[PDB]
Design a binder for this molecule. Structure first.
Ligand SMILES: OC[C@H]1O[C@@H](O[C@H]2[C@H](O)[C@@H](O)[C@H](O)O[C@@H]2CO)[C@H](O)[C@@H](O)[C@H]1O
Length: 278
């Protein structure tokens, strides 16, 4: 409540379309040394009536030191389900809710902590709200089930200079390695991002005319098996700026002319939950 910026609470948003299996709602924010609690709700209602069903209610309690989940329907609350609250008053929070056909999978700090079985129709979720002692800094709802190996084209402009490709993924618990390729029309790979847990390093290289280049590694692998990560590839003037979980992990000098990077491939031991061009 010190600064504004955006996402002022009480925050409310009407979904373009009902929440569907494979989609994720991401909520990030800051709390104060005096914060007591805040809530995240997936609710029904018409358009602004407010008071209908609440398929999923999440209460983050600093007083009780617990994260509590419940559902409200037909004018009554069900039995609450609890998990420990890993957060201390102050410091940032990162809560993500992914819908599936039988439950919601909730992660805290990119670690899965709760599987909440649906008690009422997921399709009943038409809005979501966030309120309480929290300063919201980021909110996003989208994604789908991305099959892996994955391959797709990038818009018309592609990963052009000044743009960034954002990928939300989770390295498999017992996976060994995975990769992300940013390609050009002819198949050359401008940037090959290859985390190798068996080698404790992320390999970066380019594939030009069927041949692999030098290879840039080292920098201590910031990823961890089973934990979600936010990968951002920023196309800048002289090089790609690779961010991992909000921190610049490395830079990669362009070996191929930037511009026209209109292809994407993802493979290996990884689960993809979101891809956006920002
Ligand atoms: O260095 C990136 C590059 O690795 C190639 O595999 C390398 C391997 O990393 C290296 O240890 C070995 O000595 O040579 C291999 C190539 O013959 C991958 O094939 C290539 O796709 C890039 O990922």
């Amino acid at each position: 409540m010190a600064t504004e910026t955006n996402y002022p609470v009480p925050y409310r948003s009407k979904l373009t379309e009902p929440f569907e299996p494979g989609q994720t709602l991401i909520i990030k924010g800051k709390t104060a040394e005096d914060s007591v609690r805040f809530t995240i709700n997936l609710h029904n209602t018409s358009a602004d009536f407010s008071g209908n069903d609440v398929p999923l209610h999440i209460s983050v309690r600093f007083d009780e030191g617990k994260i509590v989940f419940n559902t409200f329907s037909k004018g009554e609350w069900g039995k609450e389900e609890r998990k420990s609250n890993p957060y201390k008053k102050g410091d940032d929070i990162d809560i993500r809710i992914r819908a599936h056909d039988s439950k919601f999978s909730i992660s805290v700090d990119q670690k899965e902590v709760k599987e909440y079985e649906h008690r009422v129709p997921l399709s009943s979720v038409t809005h979501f709200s966030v309120d309480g002692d929290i300063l919201i800094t980021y909110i996003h709802w989208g994604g789908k089930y991305y099959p892996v190996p994955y391959e797709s084209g990038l818009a018309g402009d592609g990963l052009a200079p000044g743009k960034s490709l954002l990928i939300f993924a989770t390295p498999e618990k017992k996976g060994k390695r995975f990769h992300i390729n940013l390609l050009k029309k002819n198949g050359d790979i401008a940037l090959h991002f290859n985390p190798r847990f068996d080698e404790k390093a992320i390999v970066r290289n380019s594939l030009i005319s069927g041949e692999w280049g030098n290879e840039e590694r080292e920098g201590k692998n910031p990823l961890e098996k089973g934990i979600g990560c936010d990968l951002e590839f920023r196309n800048e003037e002289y090089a790609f700026q690779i961010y991992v979980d909000g921190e610049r992990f490395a830079t990669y000098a362009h070996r191929l002319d930037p511009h026209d990077i209109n292809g994407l491939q993802i493979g290996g031991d990884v689960e993809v939950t979101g891809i956006q061009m920002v």
